[PDB]
Amino acid sequence: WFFGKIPRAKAEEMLSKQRHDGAFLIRESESAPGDFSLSVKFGNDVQHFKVLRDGAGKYFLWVVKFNSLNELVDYHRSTSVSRNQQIFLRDIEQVPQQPT
């Protein structure tokens, strides 16, 4: 669900292209090392949530924090995340791997 340097636009397409509802995708800055931004699809609008961190790598949003980003996507994948409806983080179909 992680993506290197990609414009908010590209992300919206990655989620929309999906079939389920609640596709999440975390993108990282280009020259901003240590930055993380989650992009989830909600209906006909692609929302997002700026991810923060403190100490060293530990990230968080409001009152929840973890060591790795994986703990965030998971925690929210089972526990509510939106402050409007009841939706979870759906595992996005990361880029396909077609080896030779």
Task: Compute how many residues bind ligand DTF; rule: CB under 6 A.
Answer: 8
Helices (H) and strands (E) in the chain, counts: 2, 6
Q: Determine whether 84 is exposed, middle or buried from the number of CB atoms within 10 Å of its CB (0-12, 13-18, 19+).
A: exposed
* Residue 5 binding ligand DTF, by CB under 6 A: no
**CB of 18 or CB of 37, closer to ligand DTF:** 37
Half-sphere exposure of 51 (CA within 13 A, CB side): 29
CA 43/CA 99 separation, integer angstroms: 34
* Residue 10 binding ligand DTF, by CB under 6 A: no
* DSSP letter, residue 96: -
**CB of 52 or CB of 94, closer to ligand DTF:** 52
Residues in 49-78 that interact with ligand DTF by CB under 6 A: 49-50, 52, 61
**CB of 61 or CB of 87, closer to ligand DTF:** 61
| Residues forming the site for ligand DTF (CB under 6 A) | 8, 37, 47-50, 52, 61
